[PDB]
Design an enzyme around this catalytic site. Structure first.
Site, mmCIF file in Angstrom:
data_model
loop_
_atom_site.group_PDB
_atom_site.id
_atom_site.type_symbol
_atom_site.label_atom_id
_atom_site.label_comp_id
_atom_site.label_asym_id
_atom_site.label_seq_id
_atom_site.Cartn_x
_atom_site.Cartn_y
_atom_site.Cartn_z
ATOM 1 C CG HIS A 1 3.892 -6.783 -4.693
ATOM 2 N ND1 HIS A 1 2.760 -7.371 -5.222
ATOM 3 C CD2 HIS A 1 3.611 -6.498 -3.401
ATOM 4 C CE1 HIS A 1 1.828 -7.439 -4.288
ATOM 5 N NE2 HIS A 1 2.317 -6.904 -3.171
ATOM 6 C CE1 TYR B 1 0.397 -3.599 5.864
ATOM 7 C CE2 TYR B 1 1.978 -5.250 6.573
ATOM 8 C CZ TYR B 1 0.754 -4.927 6.039
ATOM 9 O OH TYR B 1 -0.089 -5.953 5.665
ATOM 10 C CD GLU C 1 -1.608 -7.756 -2.304
ATOM 11 O OE1 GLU C 1 -0.351 -7.849 -2.457
ATOM 12 O OE2 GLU C 1 -2.158 -7.531 -1.182
ATOM 13 C CB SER D 1 -1.259 -1.990 2.706
ATOM 14 O OG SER D 1 -1.357 -2.771 1.545
ATOM 15 C CG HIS E 1 2.951 -10.980 -1.566
ATOM 16 N ND1 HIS E 1 4.000 -10.149 -1.238
ATOM 17 C CD2 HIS E 1 1.838 -10.213 -1.502
ATOM 18 C CE1 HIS E 1 3.539 -8.941 -0.959
ATOM 19 N NE2 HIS E 1 2.228 -8.953 -1.110
ATOM 20 N N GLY F 1 -7.108 -6.572 6.759
ATOM 21 C CA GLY F 1 -6.042 -6.306 5.828
ATOM 22 C C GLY F 1 -6.441 -6.435 4.376
HETATM 23 NI NI NI Z 1 1.240 -7.118 -1.346
#
Ligand code: NI
Ligand code: NI
Ligand code: NI
Ligand SMILES: [Zn+2]
Length: 351
Positions: free
Chosen positions: A274, A175, A188, A286, A186, A168
């Protein structure tokens, strides 16, 4: 300053690259930073109409979602905590059937603002299932532009030098969304960038806080979740904390909103908080990436201290290669470099 004058409102920008600008991923990221896009923490990039990452999505009904998550949300007055219940593996076909069933499907509405209100009013009822963190890609193998499986940024130095893959993070996740499935506030892991492509389906709505104001959101969260803040130095990385836009407004937290439609990219930037939610059945892809600017963020990232979030990237290779003049100082705990969140990444210089 020059950087302070670009995108001074720190609003989410949208870009429509031509196919020629689109062909070099790292270069276009530096271009959008030259326009100030990073100050919002989130940017939309609409790819050329003529560009497609896959010819069709009619051949994935039997793809396995190994660990779908039932999202139970608890809270009130715009403040919530999401608990995960892992469900048994299911196929995309099975997941779509549930997503579109009367029990779970998108409610009727007119303006986006009405759906948004329905989400914040109902997110603790009828817990949905999110097909999250599926290892894989939906890109066809020969697509070379903005291919999430091989973006060729300097994040590649992790695997190249040590062989380490982090699912990831330097590999793609899929997703599968349904109505009311959420992603909590959060940044990253290691405060990296992320890229997010909506392959198909209903929209995904986003909230973002400017990196230059992330500490303000953190102060709010620690205040309103004092328990969590005692137990972990970075509890937002647990991805369990939801905060409504009305709550952000009530306490003067700067933010912007945007809705991502199928076939659009979203870029998140280092230390950009975000959160958001899915409108209905959909599928997104992602992963993380970096630029030279990210290195200081990785050095300074405040990590989860309670072992709930285990992702940690060794910064030593980056500091040696890109900051040789600060390496010995950094090893000694004496590198007091301060981040100016408004500055664009050095690769942006040509623009
Ligand atoms: Ni994110
Ligand atoms: Ni400001
Ligand atoms: Ni302030
Ligand atoms: Zn923690």
């Amino acid at each position: 300053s020059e950087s302070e004058t670009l995108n001074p409102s720190a609003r989410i920008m949208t870009f429509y690259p031509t196919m020629e600008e689109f062909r070099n991923f790292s270069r276009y990221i530096a271009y959008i930073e030259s326009q100030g896009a990073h100050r919002a923490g989130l940017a939309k990039v609409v790819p050329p109409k003529e560009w497609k990452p896959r010819a069709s999505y009619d051949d994935i009904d039997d793809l396995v979602i190994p660990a779908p998550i039932q999202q139970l949300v608890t809270g009130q007055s715009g403040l919530f905590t999401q608990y995960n219940i892992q469900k048994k593996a299911m196929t995309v076909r099975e997941f779509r059937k549930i997503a579109n069933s009367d029990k779970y499907c998108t409610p009727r509405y007119s303006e986006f603002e009405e759906l948004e209100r329905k989400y914040w009013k109902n997110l603790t009822f009828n817990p949905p299932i999110y097909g999250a963190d599926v290892n894989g890609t939906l890109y066809e193998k020969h697509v070379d532009e903005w291919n999430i499986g091989r973006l060729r940024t300097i994040l590649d130095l992790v695997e190249k030098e040590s062989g380490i893959t982090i699912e990831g993070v330097n590999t793609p996740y899929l997703y599968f969304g349904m109505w009311k499935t959420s992603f909590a506030w959060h940044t990253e892991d290691m405060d990296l960038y992320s890229i997010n492509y909506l392959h198909f389906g209903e929209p995904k709505s986003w909230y973002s806080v400017p990196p230059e104001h992330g500490k303000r959101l953190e102060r709010l969260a620690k205040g309103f979740f004092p328990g969590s803040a005692q137990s972990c130095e970075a509890f937002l990385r647990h991805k369990m904390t939801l905060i409504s836009p009305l709550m952000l407004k009530k306490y003067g937290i700067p933010f912007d909103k945007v809705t991502q439609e199928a076939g659009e990219f979203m870029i998140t930037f280092p230390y950009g908080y975000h959160a958001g939610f899915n409108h209905g059945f959909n599928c997104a892809e992602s992963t993380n990436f970096a630029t030279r600017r990210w290195i200081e963020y990785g050095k300074q990232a405040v990590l989860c201290s309670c072992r709930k979030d285990m992702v940690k990237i060794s910064m030593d290779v980056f500091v040696r290669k890109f900051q040789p003049e600060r390496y010995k100082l950094w090893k000694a705990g004496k590198d007091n470099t301060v981040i100016d969140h408004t500055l664009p990444t050095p690769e942006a210089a040509e623009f």
